[PDB]
């Protein structure tokens, strides 16, 4: 239930946290611017816005009956598009982050230089998912291993 | 048972150582040069941040000491370039200065005769020729410067380396990764895992 | 080891022881343981011386 | 109912989610309701420091990424011587070788963006993302750390 | 117061414171017897060692 | 889990929650267990030769 919950709260902080919007830045301023110087550078500033719205829505429705030929069609679809928000989120962290983390299928781009944009939702993905993936088995798991050196013992 | 023887041886040584121690130185040494060890390590942990900024531009990012050189943002302000001297030489000179002498001269005619002194000598070894590894890894170286502050500046260095080639490589990040490694001397599961890890990694 | 370093508490050285113581008474042882060582111282012382 | 417012906001812051504030913080309440929890604290003190063992092999990995031969002329050458072868036969073839070488160097850075009616390519592009790299250092290590604390991969 | 024981120681212891308481111781026896049986071993050493 | 995906949320969600609670509860708990028995089982020898 711990992890449970840090993925509740993780949930909420998904695509809902800054940095990266014009806040915070504012704061720065103070610071402004740067210075000185130189060289180079440039300038610066810063921016703004903011603002926004919201809203609310939711629704649905588808129826038919005779929608079928959508559905059987897009049974076999998928795309990585959220599309949000937050019974969503939280059944999709759930889920990918239960498999083996890994993160939002959601990339996470433009880089250039000295970042938080990155840095933002990376720093958060990756300590988010290590901290309690190393840690929803090193429980389970540990406590599960330790119950029975216990008793054993 | 034892124891014782061883114791014885160881013682013686113691014784011587014691012778030485006493014795014384011148002035011283030890502690003083404790100050220069420990901020030795401070100064690892600088070289780690700005080896983040790597050269080229930049002075945008940065990173707070956090509670010793207030000089820093004086470092940062003509940034990497006078990082081509500033971890590179404060570094260098302290430690070989402060913790060579204390290192020696607490022990150096000690370690006669017994197998502990061996491998303190040992550590006269891993600390003396890696450390000038890191001397001679950024001066040439050779020278230058430085003071204040300034100026710054530067130158160169160178030387050678170249032839044849290887030629020429990546030379500075060779001290940086070295001197985490003494970051790795510091503590201790580290060696844990090692001392069972004799013929175990044959069960890899 | 560390549960065998407790002769040095526990015891050582011487030686172981024991303690045981017783207581114791015065013692106691412781112281012784304291004381031883011283022884050685012682040785040383022882040686020185021787015366 | 009413208202209420007051403041916040100033400045931006300004507002936030101000009732997920509450909600996390009062099952960090349930989280004190209990024990294991304490125990992994507990021995966690210097040694979440182990934790920056991995984090410093991958630094130096980093820069022995795309940075390191074999696979140059130099170584060659040486070778020469041786040359051539022888013888013888048978057958053869011659051879030779070659060379160159050288270169350059340069430087650058830047960036810016703004707008903000470029708006359509962030759009699109934030729906993106591309395996060309596209380098270096602040990336390569926020990448190794991504992936690389994934699942090596 | 118361015282014793218271016071014682315581017161112282316071114051112062250581320781104281306691150781071981208681118861057982021882002793018684035993002391007892000291006070039988003075209740016939220096009786008969004297008599 | 299944390469095959399970759509159409909407809200108030059973139509995933069907097979996607079905899922990684399973997958996880299964997982979780291969995993941490045939592991813990065999570590547990290890402590318990080795003791």
């Not at chain 2, 420990?38 to 956090?66: C, D, H, Q, W």
């Not at chain 4, 990995?61 to 074999?70: A, E, N, T």
């Not at chain 4, 002329?73 to 020469?80: G, H, Q, S, T, Y």
Request: aromatic share 12%.
């Amino acid at each position: 239930a711990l992890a449970l919950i840090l993925v509740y709260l993780f949930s909420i902080v998904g695509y809902l946290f800054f940095k990266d919007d014009f806040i915070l830045e504012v704061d720065r301023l103070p610071n402004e611017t740067a210075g000185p110087e130189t060289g180079e550078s440039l300038a610066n500033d810063f921016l703004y816005s903011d603002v926004c719205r919201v809203e609310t829505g939711e629704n649905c429705t588808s129826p038919a009956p005779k929608e079928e030929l959508l559905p059987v069609e897009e049974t076999e679809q998928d795309k990585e598009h959220t599309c949000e928000t937050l019974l969503m989120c939280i059944v999709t962290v759930l889920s990918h982050g239960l498999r083996s983390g890994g993160g939002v299928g959601d990339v996470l781009r433009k880089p250039s230089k000295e970042e938080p944009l990155f840095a933002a939702r990376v720093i958060y993905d990756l300590l988010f998912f290590f901290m309690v993936i190393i840690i929803v088995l090193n429980l389970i798991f540990g406590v599960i291993i330790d119950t029975f050196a216990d008793l054993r013992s | 048972d034892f124891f014782l023887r061883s114791e014885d041886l160881f013682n013686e040584m113691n014784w011587q150582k014691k012778l030485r121690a006493q014795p014384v130185l011148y002035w011283c040494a030890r502690n003083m040069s404790f100050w220069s060890s420990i901020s030795f390590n401070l100064a690892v942990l600088m070289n780690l941040l700005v080896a983040f900024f790597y050269p080229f531009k930049g002075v945008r990012g940065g990173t707070l000491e956090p509670h010793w050189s207030g000089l820093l943002w004086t470092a940062m302000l003509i940034s990497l370039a006078i990082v081509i001297a500033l971890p590179k030489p404060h570094g260098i000179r302290a430690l070989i200065a402060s913790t060579i002498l204390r290192l020696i001269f607490s022990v150096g005619l000690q370690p006669t005769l017994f197998l502990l002194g061996a491998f303190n000598v040992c550590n006269k070894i891993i600390f003396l020729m890696s450390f000038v590894g890191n001397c001679g890894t950024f001066t040439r170286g050779y020278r230058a410067m430085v003071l204040d502050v300034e100026f710054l500046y530067h130158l160169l260095y160178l030387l050678i380396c170249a032839m044849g080639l290887f030629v020429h490589e990546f030379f500075y990040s060779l001290l940086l990764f070295d001197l985490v490694y003494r970051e790795e001397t510091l503590l201790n599961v580290i060696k844990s895992v090692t001392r069972n890890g004799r013929p175990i990694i044959l069960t890899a | 080891e560390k549960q065998k370093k407790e002769e040095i508490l526990k015891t050582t050285c011487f030686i172981c022881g024991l303690e045981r113581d017783k207581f114791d008474n015065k013692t106691v042882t412781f112281e012784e343981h304291i004381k031883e060582e011283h022884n050685m111282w012682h040785y040383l012382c022882f040686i020185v011386l021787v015366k | 109912h009413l208202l209420y417012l007051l403041i916040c906001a100033m400045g931006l812051f300004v507002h936030e989610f101000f009732y997920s504030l509450l909600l996390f913080d009062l099952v960090y309440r349930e989280e004190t309701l209990l024990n294991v929890i304490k125990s992994v604290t507990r021995n966690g003190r210097p040694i979440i420091l182990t934790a920056a063992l991995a984090l410093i092999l991958v630094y130096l990995f980093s820069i022995v990424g795309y940075l390191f031969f074999k696979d140059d002329f130099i170584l060659e050458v040486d070778r020469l011587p041786n040359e051539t072868a022888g013888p013888e036969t048978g057958e053869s073839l011659a051879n030779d070788f070659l060379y160159s070488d050288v270169c350059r160097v340069e430087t650058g850075e830047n960036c810016t963006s703004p707008a903000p009616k470029e708006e359509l390519l962030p759009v699109e592009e934030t729906e993106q993302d591309k395996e060309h790299t596209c380098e270096t250092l602040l990336m390569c290590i926020v990448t190794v750390l991504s992936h690389g604390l994934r699942s090596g991969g | 117061v118361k015282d014793s024981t218271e016071y014682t120681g315581p017161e112282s212891y316071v114051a112062e414171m250581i320781r104281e308481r306691n150781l071981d111781w208681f118861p057982r026896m021882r002793a018684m017897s035993l002391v007892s049986s000291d006070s039988e071993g003075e209740q016939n050493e220096l009786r008969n060692l004297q008599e």
